[PDB]
Design an enzyme around this catalytic site. Structure first.
Site, PDB file in Angstrom:
ATOM      1  N   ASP A 187       0.855  -1.174   0.000  1.00 37.41           N
ATOM      2  CA  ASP A 187       0.000   0.000   0.000  1.00 37.41           C
ATOM      3  C   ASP A 187       0.900   1.236   0.000  1.00 37.41           C
ATOM      4  O   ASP A 187       2.117   1.127   0.129  1.00 37.41           O
ATOM      5  CB  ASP A 187      -0.906   0.026   1.247  1.00 37.41           C
ATOM      6  CG  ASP A 187      -0.110  -0.049   2.540  1.00 37.41           C
ATOM      7  OD1 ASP A 187       0.134  -1.175   2.989  1.00 37.41           O
ATOM      8  OD2 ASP A 187       0.250   1.026   3.079  1.00 37.41           O
ATOM      9  N   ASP A 194       0.469   3.676   2.328  1.00 38.26           N
ATOM     10  CA  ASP A 194       0.126   4.276   3.624  1.00 38.26           C
ATOM     11  C   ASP A 194      -1.025   5.285   3.431  1.00 38.26           C
ATOM     12  O   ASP A 194      -2.041   4.895   2.857  1.00 38.26           O
ATOM     13  CB  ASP A 194       1.373   4.846   4.310  1.00 38.26           C
ATOM     14  CG  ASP A 194       1.163   5.077   5.803  1.00 38.26           C
ATOM     15  OD1 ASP A 194       0.523   4.233   6.469  1.00 38.26           O
ATOM     16  OD2 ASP A 194       1.629   6.121   6.321  1.00 38.26           O
TER      17      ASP A 194
END
Ligand SMILES: C#CCCCSC[C@H]1CN(Cc2c[nH]c3c(N)ncnc23)C[C@@H]1O
Ligand SMILES: C#CCCCSC[C@H]1CN(Cc2c[nH]c3c(N)ncnc23)C[C@@H]1O
Ligand SMILES: C#CCCCSC[C@H]1CN(Cc2c[nH]c3c(N)ncnc23)C[C@@H]1O
Ligand SMILES: [Cl-]
EC number: 2.4.2.28
Lengths: 274, 274, 274
Positions: C214, C216
């Protein structure tokens, strides 16, 4: 004129009982447990002092496990007006060379495991909620005497500096060392916090003789810190802290502290809601 | 249309039971221990509320020792859909003057001693591993109502801000205060984390009325923070938080929250691996 | 020529016993408590390995509660010369895309609750005060083999990177995510510290295969991290870590480590004051 009594907390390689004349050992208990080791009572010229080894006299206690509360409480109970300490540290600045002294004036906390107040709700000796001011954590008058004395001794000594105190016991990564430089830290250790905080709660004039022992690891191309390197540098330079303490303490004893101490007492007292 | 119930956590100088009509005291127990004090059940106009003093009604509990888990659990168990809190804070920005309100939208954690989840593996009431998202820690819809209401009241109010939450109970050093400014913090306190985190795990709309009480200590040349200064500023300005809560809460009760609450419930539920 | 034995600590979605041939389960006890789960003993080609699920095989243990001490002790006791781990992480850099591997070379600690040394004064098995160097926390020779192997496999792989390890279990706020970028962090997780620190104390060659899952939450305008997103990315990309481990480990077994291991043993030994 009015009486002073100087607590001395000795750090790594820098905790030598021979500094005091007329020495007597005294083990004490406190409401926060036992201090790191016996208090050593003695004198420097006409001035009463109390020496304590931060890590124990055989260096058996790592920074995270030092009983900062008991140490400061013990010195306060013995009647100390001042606590002057030694601390080894890494240099985060080219101009702070190994062997230099830094009379630090600020800190940045990176500790995580440490009680930072006497007022934890659990001790009848320290009742209430206490929020101590930390704008000026170190006594400027005591620092001034240290700085002037270092100059009279011809020592390489920096008149201010920001200490970052890490939890340890590991040393910092390189990414951490670089980061602390960007934060404006000048030197790095594992013990200034919460020692300085608790001294302020106690209404004690606190100052710190920081001795640079290494350049941490922010020079990617050069020798990084290790235990052996730290201990070697201290072996070479310990005499400087000893001479500085021996020469500073009589000067402290020759001036008047009642107003300074009154102001510290009031700052501490008015930080507590009973 | 659908029912709301507003939890109110009162901070330093800002925890006044007289805000509620038709008050009844209720002590509760939770799986995480006792809340800071009794829940005060009551109403603001037609809206059910539950007041709780963060530090106890006599301000006996320091920030590190506040049972954030029990407080949030207690409010959730009572049926709160929203938790709107007050918090005193230091200003890290010239434009945030003492007495100003800041409807904070972000935080930076500097706490060290605090449980930040209900899902610690030890409580049958909160089973599994929970990783809650914190990209948007505060409810934007609740914040919007606070901001608009502050404007209707003519109050000096900042529409966003980043709170750095320090462990305390000491105030920050000057080096720390300067550093937090470089990190983009706008205000400083000791209580937002983990309160905001636990509210999100609970699926509760959380917002914070931060009231600036001082400029911390980043003006080297000016008055630095102390307990007396904080309490004086709050005495002068507490009425503003009270009026803001009194006026905001009926507006919250007059709009529809089911979708907002559903989305928060799902975010919380899908953060847990059972 | 001389024997190696590879400990493998499997992280989130990345802890698959099928990687080893000739598998046998072995539960062990250590002076620091029980490891996260059974050790799985087995082989990759001719090389002895020991697999351990960081979070337990059912992912029941959150990062703060992982017994890093017991895990590393258990692997050392089993005879591991190397510990190669997997770790999911958030990307803090546009060029580190979800699914990319990062062979991290530095860390920044943001943890608060974690023992970082075996030498805590409480265990007869680890006596003394230990200050381990962290300038180069990861084994460069092991990292080099990982990097070259990733290239031979055609994988998107970054040859260095700084991991910020947060306490969790919450994800970071946006203000925190932005701040970590300014500190020079490249990826973010909850487990590298103190795992890497304890491996160094143990004299073990440690390296980490970080897998970005991801971004974040530092893109205010884009999807932020959640449990579902992390697990989805790992489902898609886990095969890459498996192939990298399968291909790297025989190459490790085919070269000579005695000097590398001797130097690590000496660094560890000389960090302790007995
Ligand atoms: C084992 C043993 C005896 C102590 C060996 S040196 C480690 C002590 C010195 N002390 C100060 C210090 C010197 N250089 C440092 C550095 N680079 N980082 C953090 N702390 C320090 C930290 C710790 O208490
Ligand atoms: C003793 C006592 C009663 C409380 C006196 S003021 C201290 C509280 C106010 N609270 C917020 C605050 C105001 N100014 C601050 C500052 N400058 N730094 C951190 N926190 C604060 C911290 C603590 O809970
Ligand atoms: C609940 C459950 C199962 C785990 C779901 S994902 C959370 C794990 C992944 N792990 C690494 C990670 C991925 N993305 C991250 C991020 N953005 N911040 C911090 N850590 C991470 C943190 C934690 O151990
Ligand atoms: Cl930090």
């Amino acid at each position: 004129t009015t009486a002073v009594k100087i607590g001395i907390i000795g750090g790594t390689g820098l905790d030598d009982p021979e500094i005091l004349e007329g020495r007597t050992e005294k083990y004490v208990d406190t409401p926060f447990g036992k201090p790191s080791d016996a208090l050593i009572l003695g004198k420097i010229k006409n001035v009463d002092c109390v020496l304590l080894a931060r890590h124990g006299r055989q260096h058996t206690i790592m920074p995270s496990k030092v009983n900062y509360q008991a140490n400061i409480w013990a010195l306060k109970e013995e009647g100390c007006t001042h606590v002057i300490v030694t601390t080894a540290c890494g240099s985060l600045r080219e101009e702070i060379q190994p062997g230099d002294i830094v009379i630090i004036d600020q800190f940045i906390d990176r500790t995580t495991m440490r009680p930072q107040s006497f007022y934890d709700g659990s001790h009848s000796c320290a009742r209430g909620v206490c929020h101590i001011p930390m704008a000026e954590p170190f006594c400027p008058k005591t620092r001034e005497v240290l700085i002037e004395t270092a100059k009279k001794l011809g020592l390489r000594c920096h008149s201010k500096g920001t200490m970052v105190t890490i939890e340890g016991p590991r040393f910092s990564s390189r990414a951490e060392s670089f980061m602390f430089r960007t934060w404006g830290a000048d030197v790095i250790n594992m013990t200034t916090v919460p020692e300085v905080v608790l001294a302020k709660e106690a209404g004690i004039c606190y100052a710190s003789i920081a001795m640079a022992t290494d350049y941490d690891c922010w020079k990617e191309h050069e020798e990084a810190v290790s235990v052996d390197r730290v201990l070697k540098t201290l072996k070479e330079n310990a005499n400087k802290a000893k001479s500085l303490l021996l020469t500073t303490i009589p000067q402290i004893g020759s001036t008047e502290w009642s107003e300074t101490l009154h102001n510290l007492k009031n700052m501490a007292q008015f930080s507590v809601l009973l």
